[PDB]
Amino acid sequence: MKIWSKEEVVNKLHEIKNKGYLSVPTDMFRTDDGVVGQILERQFGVQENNITLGDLGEFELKGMRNRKAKSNLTLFHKKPVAGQTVIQIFNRFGYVKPEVMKKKLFTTIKGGRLNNLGLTLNAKHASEINLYYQDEYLSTWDLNLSKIEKLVLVFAETIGRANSPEEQFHFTKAYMLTEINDITSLINDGVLVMDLCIDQDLSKSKGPHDRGPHLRIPISKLDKLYRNIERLL
Numbered sequence: 001m002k003i004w005s006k007e008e009v010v011n012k013l014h015e016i017k018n019k020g021y022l023s024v025p026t027d028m029f030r031t032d033d034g035v036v037g038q039i040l041e042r043q044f045g046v047q048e049n050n051i052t053l054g055d056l057g058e059f060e061l062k063g064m065r066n067r068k069a070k071s072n073l074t075l076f077h078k079k080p081v082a083g084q085t086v087i088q089i090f091n092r093f094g095y096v097k098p099e100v101m102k103k104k105l106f107t108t109i110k111g112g113r114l115n116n117l118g119l120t121l122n123a124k125h126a127s128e129i130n131l132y133y134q135d136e137y138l139s140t141w142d143l144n145l146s147k148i149e150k151l152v153l154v155f156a157e158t159i160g161r162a163n164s165p166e167e168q169f170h171f172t173k174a175y176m177l178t179e180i181n182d183i184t185s186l187i188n189d190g191v192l193v194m195d196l197c198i199d200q201d202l203s204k205s206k207g208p209h210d211r212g213p214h215l216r217i218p219i220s221k222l223d224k225l226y227r228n229i230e231r232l233l
Contacts, residue, residue, distance in 0.1 A: 002046075004053050006176075009152060013174050013233040016043045021159060021168040032163070036063035039169055040154055051152070059150040059176075064219070065162070066155040066173065072216040075148055075192070076141070079213065083131070083139030086210045090198040093117055093133070101202035110190040121194060126183035129194070129215070141194075143183065143215070151177040152232070172233070179227035191224055192217050 016022075024030070028038060037049060040063035044051065052058050064071060079086060094105035111121040114134065122130045126145055131138040153176075156169040186192050197211040217225055 004051050006053055010232050012044060016171045021170045023168055036156055057150055059152050061152050063154050066157050071219050073219055075215045077212050077214050080139040080141050087208055090208055103202055104199045106197050109194040111188040112190040121187055123184050123187040149180045174233035176230045176232050177226040181225055186224060191221055
């Protein structure tokens with residue numbers, strides 16, 4: 001595997017910035033989300049969302065649009081490893097509305113407080129996030145501290161409408177984030193936020209459409225998660 005140096009990363013960041021506004025490659029398969037990171041990876045010449053730096057270790061490579069308004073960094077996008085599945089949560093806590101029925105669970109969940117549905121998060125160690133309804137346990141996600149310990153986060157200015165085929169991206173700022181704080185307090189103080197998003201056309205014979213649970217943190221709160229935030233570009 002390719003080993004990078006920090007200087008190589010910084011040089012690459014400048015190389016990309018110097019190209020100006022980049023278009024979305026058409027040979028690239030795309031879903032509804034993640035285009036910024038896809039382009040960033042292509043510009044780094046890599047096929048995954050991480051790179052290994054010499055003695056410094058493995059860094060996630062993440063891209064975001066630059067916005068004045070609030071935005072969120074995604075920390076994970078995955079299913080629980082134990083307890084109730086996302087579908088079993090959806091079946092129980094989702095609600096029905098109409099023409100003919102559709103069922104839905106679009107909810108945001110934090111530690112420290114129950115939300116409108118009675119749902120909340122708890123951690124005993126950083127390593128693990130548990131979904132409860134009130135004091136009843138439901139499911140568990142693992143948070144891989146090792147994966148998020150070290151991050152190269154790159155911001156793009158854009159022209160054109162977000163997620164359109166004609167959108168263009170100019171990567172102009174980047175940061176190296178390391179030295180991760182104990183996440184227990186960030187979960188239990190409501191800093192890290194989970195979302196569940198599942199719905200279903202109850203007339204049809206198609207299964208539920210689960211967009212996949214996310215754990216996210218506001219960009220404005222990154223200094224609560226990382227003790228060392230260094231501007232690279």
